[PDB]
């Protein structure tokens, strides 16, 4: 990889860009004819928001996302991975990819409202005060619609609004 | 009043003698090949020549100007 290190010594700031170690691909990917890493490793429709081992290979050291021109993902898999990583961030997963901040974590907010498959940003969704009639109820989005094509073993489709 | 009026008395031979025009045999020959009346067209022009691409680009600019009247 690459990094920038700044050394202040005697009113002189040395700015250096150094190259560090980098992990390569595994020796024998199963489908070398594929285009995306997901297609190459046959992971298409085979990963969820729980697969942090797969998600964290596409994300910045501070919980951010990496661009497609670097990762190599297709447009569809990029959106799938980005939404999955948002849900993983909101689910309390990825503890070491927290946003960087000098001292702002000391005023701890509301305690651990445990949650998962969180689609929207928790601080921007209004309560459902009226719920509508039986034939049109205001449902609650659970999960992401961009994972509707994942492999299903339950013989019943995944429920996205419940 | 003020408006530029310097109108030399152009007679049948005024501008043939007011300035020292040299005989036709003394000017170089490359002067008498210019396209005078109409400008030349794409089909007349060779896709290899640079003026071909200049004219094609002028047509492209005209098309862009025509189209870009309602697009913000």
């Amino acid at each position: 990889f690459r990094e920038v290190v700044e050394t202040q010594e005697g009113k002189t700031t040395i700015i250096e860009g150094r190259i560090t170690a980098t992990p390569k691909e595994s020796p024998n990917p199963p489908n070398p004819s594929g285009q995306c890493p997901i297609c190459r490793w046959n992971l298409k429709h085979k990963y969820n928001y729980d697969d942090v081992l797969l998600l964290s290979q596409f994300i910045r050291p501070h919980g951010g996302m990496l661009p497609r021109k670097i990762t190599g993902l297709c447009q569809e898999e990029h959106r799938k991975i980005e939404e999955c990583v948002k849900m993983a961030h909101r689910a309390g997963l990825l503890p070491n990819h927290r946003p960087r901040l000098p001292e702002g974590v000391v005023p701890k907010s509301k305690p651990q409202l445990n949650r998962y498959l969180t689609r929207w940003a928790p601080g921007s969704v209004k309560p459902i005060y009226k719920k509508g009639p039986r034939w049109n109820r205001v449902r609650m989005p659970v999960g992401s619609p961009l994972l509707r094509d994942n492999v299903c073993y339950s013989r019943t489709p995944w429920k996205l609004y419940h | 009043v003020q408006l530029t009026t310097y109108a030399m008395g152009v007679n049948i031979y005024k501008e043939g003698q007011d300035v020292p025009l040299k005989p036709d045999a003394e000017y170089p020959e490359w002067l008498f090949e210019m396209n005078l009346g109409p400008p030349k067209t794409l089909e007349e022009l060779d896709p290899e020549s640079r003026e071909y691409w200049r004219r094609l680009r002028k047509q492209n600019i005209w098309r862009h100007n025509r189209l870009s009247k309602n697009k913000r």
Binding site: - | Q59, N60, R63, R66, K69, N70
Partner: protein, 222 residues
Amino acid sequence: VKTLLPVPSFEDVSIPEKPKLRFIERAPLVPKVRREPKNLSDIRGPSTEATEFTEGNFAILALGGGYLHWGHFEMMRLTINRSMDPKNMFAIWRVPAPFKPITRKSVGHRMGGGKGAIDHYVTPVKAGRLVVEMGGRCEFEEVQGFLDQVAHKLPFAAKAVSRGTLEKMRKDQEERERNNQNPWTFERIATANMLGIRKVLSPYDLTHKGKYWGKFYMPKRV
């Protein structure tokens, strides 16, 4: 370098005299004395007239049935005549002047006592009929913009189309029809009276093929 392509030339298109839209009168010169019934079938189903381009290359295509009246005519004519270029574009009507008489009874009237007096006139329009056509030495984008402007204000669904656009829509409809993957078709079931479905369907559904519902047209219905 960016590769360049020749501009589409216009040396075989001649604009006619009087290029702006003709004034449309609200009522016929000879008013109709006899009052006719509301034969609602003149806006039902597909249009059989004015479905193809005649002289222009752009148009407003109706995607649903409805009645055009003088307010609509004035709106479209004024917007077109104030938004087009007389020297390079010409616009031609494709719907007649309002001729169908709509009668209404006096306000606060009980039911009965004959029909009402003729109040105004309308032009029936079916889905798939071109309403205004446009031609000249211009591309499609400017006319598409200021014609979708007009089409959004029509009493029915409408779009701004061109020759190539309309041909593309028709070819895509045929392609969808042939590559449809389920084996159960409205046409097949309706024509074979499968499940006795004609007790729910209409005699017009044998020809509408499920694509038309009242004065509404579904272009994704196959």
